[PDB]
Design a binder for this molecule. Structure first.
Ligand SMILES: [Cl-]
Ligand SMILES: [Cl-]
Ligand SMILES: [Cl-]
Ligand SMILES: [Cl-]
Ligand SMILES: [Cl-]
Ligand SMILES: [Cl-]
Ligand SMILES: [Mn+2]
Ligand SMILES: [Mn+2]
Ligand SMILES: [Mn+2]
Ligand SMILES: [Mn+2]
Ligand SMILES: [Mn+2]
Ligand SMILES: [Mn+2]
Ligand SMILES: [Zn+2]
Ligand SMILES: [Zn+2]
Ligand SMILES: [Zn+2]
Ligand SMILES: [Zn+2]
Ligand SMILES: [Zn+2]
Ligand SMILES: [Zn+2]
Lengths: 256, 256, 257, 257, 256, 257
């Protein structure tokens, strides 16, 4: 298995002892994803991508973080929806920091954090900085971290053309839209109910944000764009592009 | 499915709207469990118990906490072992506190916290107290929490007898011993290999603790007692006992 | 007299809030390197200048700006390894925002516009707001409203972008110390900008991931992510009018008399 | 003169530490209800009295005790809903333990015994130690050693249990305000114990789970978890000698000259 | 007894049930006090004063805080001295905050905080503000706190004359000097050896502070002024003056 | 050239630190009411002005000032119940100071002068410094030195005092929005002062203790603790010159070439 959790401590110790061990940490969230998809999408997707990449490059995958930072209206619909269960920033920051401290204790020095929930980004960044700060105080400066959001590897114009034959309207409205729904149809079809999709026009917002979050400014379903045209085939394409691109990036930063 | 993560937010909203919704949260850890068992045992076991209890009483199960508090020598072998990845107390406390705050926001009011890692206990308690303090400030006083360790439900002398026909040495040395291994043999056979079990005598300690933790005071394999006598049969018995007991406890504290 | 709260007596401020619909504006910046051609307080100067003009136009007041912001990030501000840049931890910034909101609510104020001028501050500003509003709710206050925005987001009109980038726009991701901020500085604080010192390097490009510890070799030596060679006072005057008008209208909309 | 650090001049204390193998002891207690028959500072008085005698016997010193501990839990101390009980949040207790260790390390001390007298303090004491040692490590100090113990854990000999509970021992989980602490108090602080006020109720029993908010009905009205009717100063004298001897030996073993 | 710690919870409950109960909290420190006195002086003195005041007005005294904030050169000699054991500001602030929260829970509403260590001042103030802020959230606005340093009640020129016939040189030098030593000689003579007093000239400093603290800027003995002219007689005067002055202040702020 | 770090490019700042003898100054103020006759940013303006003049004379640089300080206290600033006053919690201010020192150390700076203009900030500034130095020590840095001072403490000479308060001096404990500060302002920011609004009330007095919640009735209505009627530009100019000279010498003394 490539999952650290499924290994004995002796097996893990041996992999790290090899001195070239790469660890991967999926960071997700329990967040509403429309009327047509389950709420653990942000955990399922980065974990599935990590699994495949780890199998290609000989890396291991740590248990993913099940809860992420508060959903923001313009990216995830807003933290007023039921189901969505969010952590405070200090909590998420602290979790990332603690794990890095422990991995360094094990002797590990290479970590890939794969985020699947946009709002997690900066707290993940602070967790890394605080951890690296401590490691320096402890005389350690060779711990390297690569942070990435799997979707960012889908930029090829040709690929976008395939995924959005009618035209691409941007990633800003991709919450429970074509992209994630397609990936889910290719990985966890049983967790998708495409007939429940509400085909509303893409969400549009003014150049600012309002707090407390106003429910009226988010499409009723919770989605920011329609997944009506999502499909397994699209998911297949996305998965291949992401897996191959990420595998290459990791080989580049953590050369064998 | 009884798993909240697998439901759409609409489905979740409806279960909570019913007004009698009981939620269950498994709290585990990534911790060494000897030469013969995987490291995510503390998550897998309470999650499996929750699943079965939930199916019988009509409850829902939240994504489990994958990382818990620092392993202690007399209970989990010590936090010096490789693989074990632990959180600071404030981090675990904050995670529990944040989740409760959010569940209260959904309108949920009944929570069962099932601990699978002994060391988690007091930080789970502080997380609950801080959350309930906040809820009072918010005018909420009807949120009720039941906290339990699934193992505490195995007290029937007749059962202990069938489990330890050679005599019961206590629960203080069960880390990776007969109890957990038997459960794993019944639930996750592929994550256990009794052939690797190190049949050493039960671990014993003086009436005090020493820090920095001394590795010499913990059996080399990481286990506190031998799981040589573990069996699927024992696991099946343990499981049915815990499931039935916890289900009744919940029916008692959260009467329909 | 002045739109700045700091230049008012407590009696004057008190009277303005007594009006019942007084809008307060809070600039949130940073002390950060901005290439060889500009001073390091740009992120404070620009939003403060936009707030001043907007406040004057719609009758609002401006609170003292936050001089220090969150750690500079490589793909947005060059990186926190540069000297001069002086950054706060996330908890520190979040707490500052939270404290100020708590205090404004104590004054009786209920309308706040936070104008961020340093990209990296965004999420910590968001957390400060949420923690403050959470607290206000425990105190029985649910009518405090906050509008958060980055002034640059109001420059959307294609016709405006074409005038600013006649050779073609390449995205906002590489603007640190580039044409946009430099043009604004040329129009507002020409004394703090030396365009002759601009290093005309190609636009910074990055792979779809980030690396820590930050690698100095991945940021153009000058610290800028794009060349401000084509920056000008006229482009700055255009940006200012667009931002001021767009933001002033947004406030009238969200905070009507 | 005295074994208490607080009663020494800094010169005296300094001289003792200069010895190179000076052991320090820190009692960690609480202000908690202990039934109708005993005062509320029991958790401080007892470990402090045991520390005093142990310190005297082995040549160690005793630091001022922590007067406030973690929130009382129903199954161990009755619950934090009782009047009088004054508890600290976990972070507060953890931070106090951490600060003291940091300071002792600055004095040059490297041997500490933490004697807990309030069960609920346990894990927060543990975290204080870990955070302090983590910090000492960053400072290049890895020779600071800590021994943590609850004095009651040294009464293990069945022959002793038999004398204390001739009618049969029923576990330590119900001891709060029972035979054990009451006997020690009768031997150490007779003026602070009124055995005639004891409420002889049956041993408290609970299901295999905990409930929050704490339900007052699940704790005996007096606050005690078991009756101290059979307590006596003679039982207390026995307990004290067993603890003093056992702990003194443990310290000589872990902190030899 | 007037000490809360020596009462049973039933007795305490009864005194608070009266509705006019006044509580007193001594706040000291473990700090070096020259070659002639013990290090718990800042705990002993305020506690002694509280006892006598409490006896006269019918108040109760809470267990005192034994550890205070870091010693500052111009007030306590500096935190570079051995023996001195100080807490970080957040720790002291939180301790004060937690106690007030609990006293409020008991139903108490009148608190007198007697500081015996100058450096505690601002952290005590923050602890009080944070606690009162919290009480408001809970709906409590009738909790009142009086903060005072017993020394401030010795201002009468006549008394000053009697204490300093050779003229008073100010308070900013009264650390382990005449004032405190005189109180100790009268209250805890066994913890004072006047023959050890180092008769050095009053300490003086430039109009600024330096960090790291500079040892050479503090009189070698740790004292800021000689206590050679200290006496039991002076102590008795100080004591009675303070006890009386404070009792009157409390009667006024917490009118019977 | 400028003495303000904010107005310099990172290259100019880097060059000044590279010299190896660079001294930095950080003004720490507050947004606090100052009577009916002055603006609320006095505590930032004054220390900043003094820093500029001192910096110009000794060749030092001035960091952007902290605009928000600790909660106002009745006996010193009048109380935090006044509108306009916008205060931070202690941890927030402490962390701000701590973060800045950590960053300055990272730049290679090693000499810092913290000029406080708000009495209540004092102890939180001290804690920020201690936590930062503790941290630097873990990093292997022990050559970072900080000088903390309040410009008002350099005006003690009887010659000047007599000139400032010929009618008689009553101490500094009553100098909030009074003669000392108003005179400095009249000499530095006359437009932000209107002596015609000064409320000539008797010097404030309080019992030997504090009360919380703060009692408004114990603070003179205007918010001032002593009349500034006798304040003058002439007096301000005297103070300024005295402070600037004294501070410059103190710095020369602590941070010798
Ligand atoms: Cl997302
Ligand atoms: Cl376990
Ligand atoms: Cl920017
Ligand atoms: Cl106990
Ligand atoms: Cl003192
Ligand atoms: Cl002031
Ligand atoms: Mn998401
Ligand atoms: Mn475990
Ligand atoms: Mn920026
Ligand atoms: Mn207890
Ligand atoms: Mn003191
Ligand atoms: Mn002030
Ligand atoms: Zn998503
Ligand atoms: Zn286990
Ligand atoms: Zn910028
Ligand atoms: Zn007890
Ligand atoms: Zn003292
Ligand atoms: Zn002032």
């Amino acid at each position: 298995s490539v999952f650290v959790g499924e290994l004995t401590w002796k097996e893990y110790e041996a992999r790290v002892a090899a001195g070239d061990c790469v660890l991967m940490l999926p960071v997700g969230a329990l967040e509403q994803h429309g009327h047509h998809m389950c709420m653990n999408v942000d955990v399922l997707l980065p974990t599935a991508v990590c699994k495949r990449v780890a199998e290609r490059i000989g890396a291991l995958v740590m248990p993913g973080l099940q809860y992420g930072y508060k959903s923001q209206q313009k990216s995830g619909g807003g933290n007023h929806f039921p189901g969505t269960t969010s952590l405070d920033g200090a909590t998420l920051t602290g979790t990332v920091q603690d794990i890095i401290r422990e991995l360094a204790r094990h002797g590990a020095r290479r970590l890939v954090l794969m985020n699947g929930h946009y709002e997690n980004s900066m707290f993940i960044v602070e967790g890394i900085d605080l951890a690296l700060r401590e490691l320096r105080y402890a005389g350690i400066q060779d711990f390297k971290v690569v942070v990435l959001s799997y979707a960012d590897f889908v930029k090829d114009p040709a690929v976008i053309q395939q995924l959005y034959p009618e035209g691409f309207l941007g990633w800003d409205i991709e919450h429970g839209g074509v992209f994630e729904t397609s990936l889910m149809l290719a990985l966890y079809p049983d967790l998708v109910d495409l007939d429940r999709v509400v085909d509303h026009p893409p969400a549009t917002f003014p150049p600012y944000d309002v707090f407390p979050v106003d429910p009226a400014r988010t499409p009723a379903p919770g989605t920011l764009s329609s997944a009506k045209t999502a499909s397994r085939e699209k998911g297949e394409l996305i998965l291949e592009v992401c897996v191959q691109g990420i595998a290459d990036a990791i080989r580049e930063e953590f050369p064998p």
